[PDB]
Amino acid sequence: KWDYDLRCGEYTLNLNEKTLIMGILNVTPDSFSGSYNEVDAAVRHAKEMRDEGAHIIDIGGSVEEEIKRVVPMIQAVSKEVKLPISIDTYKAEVAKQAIEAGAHIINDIWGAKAEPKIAEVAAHYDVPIILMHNRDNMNYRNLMADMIADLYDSIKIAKDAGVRDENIILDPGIGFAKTPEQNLEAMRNLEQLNVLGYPVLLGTSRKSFIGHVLDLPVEERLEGTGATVCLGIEKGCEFVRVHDVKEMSRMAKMMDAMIGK
Amino acid sequence: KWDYDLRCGEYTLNLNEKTLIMGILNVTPDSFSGSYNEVDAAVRHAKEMRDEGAHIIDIGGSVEEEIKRVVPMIQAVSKEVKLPISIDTYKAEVAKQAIEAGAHIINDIWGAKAEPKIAEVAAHYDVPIILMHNRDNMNYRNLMADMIADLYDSIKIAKDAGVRDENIILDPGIGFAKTPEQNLEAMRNLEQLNVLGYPVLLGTSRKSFIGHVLDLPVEERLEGTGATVCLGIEKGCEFVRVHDVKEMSRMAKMMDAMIGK
Ligand SMILES: Nc1nc(N)c([N+](=O)[O-])c(=O)[nH]1
Ligand SMILES: Nc1nc(N)c([N+](=O)[O-])c(=O)[nH]1
């Protein structure tokens, strides 16, 4: 099904074996400050996520200040947790520093559109980059068709900068630039992203549209997140981006067994 | 999509609105004995399941002794919890007494085959009957094809006894007469049951094949049960039969929103 592996320097992610779990590192910063309390709680969280089945650790971030916060955490996690690190930035300079610090994958919520030079950073360090659907508006003519269009405009920016197809991952950008009904419509029609030929990452964890359906606060969205993860895997996604790693790994693992992955 | 409602005497279940949750009543009997401790813990459990989103209460059971245990519980739950009760029996006499006691739906794990007269009981009291796939062996030529064949032999026994199509529900009998790999194959191919034209109930809650995939004890199968519930709803099932009503209702509810039910 995938004729290649996702190459991440020292680590390699097989795309056929199983749904790969991306753990969302909570990055609660110190008010006083790369301080000991914030980097240690990060390492501890990354270790916990590694222990409960995460395959990648996703680490998110004033641009100079963004780097000062995220760089130390990538250094500490990179050393202490043997897992690929994605950097959750749309800024080119932030991405540069993060891979330099030890990050393996770029996670861009603006799919190379907010700062085109990020794809150029991706191309040079030769790292996988996640291009997420996003726009500064909701004026959809046709949600899915526009989504796939907007995604292609990311692929073109990426390809034009030198990014190899094998380093391109797509993300439907659930919870971004979409109404709650449009988020459900995108979930309903997720399999359409497959025609683009790239691995898909789904990021739905605890998001507002789950709460909109279930009428439940963020800490009560685990079952709703599970439904989205399940439908997502059934519709072909290679990755899920989750806060609840233990639960979602068990769910991903069971989907896999059933769908024949 | 369904041109009729599931009629259950005083209650009516719409088959289009949502995935209907069937709560599994734990029926821990007293060693000393329709005793107060066992009927009260049953009522309390049924009340709890009603509170957390169950649409039907499933109540299970020496044939004379089976009736003595289940009849009082149906009487107490029927009175105290305003929900349809299915009786989980394959015995005709047990089913007769249970509907007489207040049960609304027959839940037969042997699909009218262990005791054909049960369909006759169904036909007379004019109650919906769940015909589950089951056989006394695993000698499948072709799992899905044999399943759909074996299910039709139930529909014929039911129809021949007087059962109206509108009172027939089918169940793929997950965890019955199937290897763990065959259980996964049936989950993978559940949508095939839809060609038979009847509502499908999925019963996968906490079952051995989830533990076989996840390597987890029965009390750790909630995420794995959720995956099966999710795939099941995506594949068209009208009902899920679950122990964890709170969680599975939230999951069913989110699947519904996404798939457009
Ligand atoms: N790829 C990806 N990155 C993110 N930061 C999000 N998010 O919700 O924040 C996401 O959904 N997908
Ligand atoms: N319909 C139905 N009835 C049952 N008793 C079971 N079960 O596992 O015991 C089931 O799965 N389905």
Token digits for A82? Answer: 């043997």
Token digits for B115? Answer: 């005791």
CB A105 within 8 A of CB A85: yes
SS3 call for B69: helix
For ligand 2, say whether the CB of B203 is within 6 Å of any of its atoms: yes
Token digits for A258? Answer: 């059933």
Q: Is B167 exposed, middle or buried (0-12, 13-18, 19+ CB in 10 A)?
A: buried
Residue B207 designated active-site: yes
d(CA B87, CA B72): 12
In chain A, which residues have their Cβ closer than 8 Å to the Cβ of B210? 254
Token pair 């030890």 in the structure block, residue: A102
Give the count of alpha carbons within 13 A of B143, CB side only: 19
User: Distances from the Cα of B209 to the Cαs of B130, B184, B187, in angstroms?
Assistant: 22, 8, 11
Nearest by Cα to B139 from B93, B185, B178: B178
CB B201 within 8 A of CB B21: no
Give the count of alpha carbons within 13 A of B38, CB side only: 19
Residue A1 designated active-site: no
In chain B, which residues have their Cβ closer than 8 Å to the Cβ of A259? 188, 231
Cα A103 from chain centroid (whole Å):
13
User: Distances from the Cα of A114 to the Cαs of A63, A91, B29, B208, in angstroms?
Assistant: 14, 8, 65, 49
Cα B237 from chain centroid (whole Å):
12
How many other β-carbons are positioned within 10 Å of the β-carbon of residue A90? 20
User: Distances from the Cα of B169 to the Cαs of B105, B111, B164, B243, in angstroms?
Assistant: 10, 10, 11, 20
- Which residue out of A18, A91, A235, A241 is catalytically annotated? A241
In chain B, which residues have their Cβ closer than 8 Å to the Cβ of A253? 213-214, 224
Token digits for B66? Answer: 């089976």
User: Distances from the Cα of B245 to the Cαs of A18, A192, B53, B242, in angstroms?
Assistant: 29, 33, 6, 6
CB B83 within 8 A of CB B57: yes
CB B83 within 8 A of CB B54: yes
Token digits for B208? Answer: 């051995």
How many other β-carbons are positioned within 10 Å of the β-carbon of residue B30? 13
d(CA B246, CA B54): 8
SS3 call for B137: coil
SS3 call for B136: coil
Give B140's DSSP letter.
Answer: -
Nearest by Cα to A51 from A82, A18, A93: A82
Question: Ligand 2, atom 10: nearest CA belongs to which residue?
Answer: B203
* CB-CB under 8 Å, B251 with A223: yes
| Distance (Å) from CA B24 to ligand 2 centroid | 9
User: Distances from the Cα of B149 to the Cαs of A252, B145, B183, in angstroms?
Assistant: 32, 6, 17
Question: Ligand 1, atom 7: nearest CA belongs to which residue?
Answer: A203
Question: Ligand 1, atom 6: nearest CA belongs to which residue?
Answer: A203
Q: How do beta strands A11-13 and A6-8 pair?
A: antiparallel
Nearest to A250 among B223, B254, B259 (CB): B223
d(CA A261, CA A18): 6
Chain A contacts to B (CB-CB under 8 A): 184, 187-188, 210, 213-214, 216, 223-224, 226-228, 230-231, 234, 247-248, 250-251, 253-255, 257-260
d(CA B155, CA B130): 10
Nearest by Cα to A223 from B227, B238, B137: B227
Nearest by Cα to A198 from A177, A171, A218: A171
| Distance (Å) from CA B186 to ligand 2 centroid | 15
Q: Is A186 exposed, middle or buried (0-12, 13-18, 19+ CB in 10 A)?
A: buried
Token pair 């279940």 in the structure block, residue: B13
- Neighbouring residues of B125: CB distance < 8 A, sequence distance ≥ 6: B96, B99
d(CA A67, CA B114): 70
d(CA B195, CA B201): 14
- Which residue out of B18, B207, B221, B235 is catalytically annotated? B207
| Distance (Å) from CA B161 to ligand 1 centroid | 57
* CB-CB under 8 Å, B227 with A254: yes
SS3 call for A104: coil
Which residues approach ligand 1 with their CB closer than 6 A?
Answer: A 88, 107, 109, 130, 132, 171, 174-175, 201, 203, 241
For ligand 2, say whether the CB of B132 is within 6 Å of any of its atoms: yes
Token digits for A168? Answer: 């391109």
d(CA B129, CA B145): 22
Q: How do beta strands A201-202 and A168-171 pair?
A: unpaired
CB A83 within 8 A of CB A107: no
Q: Is B126 exposed, middle or buried (0-12, 13-18, 19+ CB in 10 A)?
A: middle
For ligand 2, say whether the CB of B201 is within 6 Å of any of its atoms: yes
Q: How do beta strands B85-88 and B56-60 pair?
A: parallel
Q: Please provide the size of chain A in residues.
A: 261
Nearest by Cα to B27 from B261, B243, B192, B213: B243
Shortest Cα–Cα distance, A80 to chain B (Å): 27
Give the neighbor-by-neighbor strand order of the sheet with B20-24. B168-171, B129-132, B105-108, B85-88, B56-60, B20-24, B239-242, B201-202
- Structural domains in chain A, CATH included, are 1-261 (3.20.20.20)
CB A13 within 8 A of CB A84: yes
d(CA A14, CA A2): 8
* CB-CB under 8 Å, B188 with A254: no
Nearest to A234 among B234, B254, B257 (CB): B234
Determine phi and psi for B9, rounding to 5 degrees: 65, -105
CB B24 within 8 A of CB B241: yes
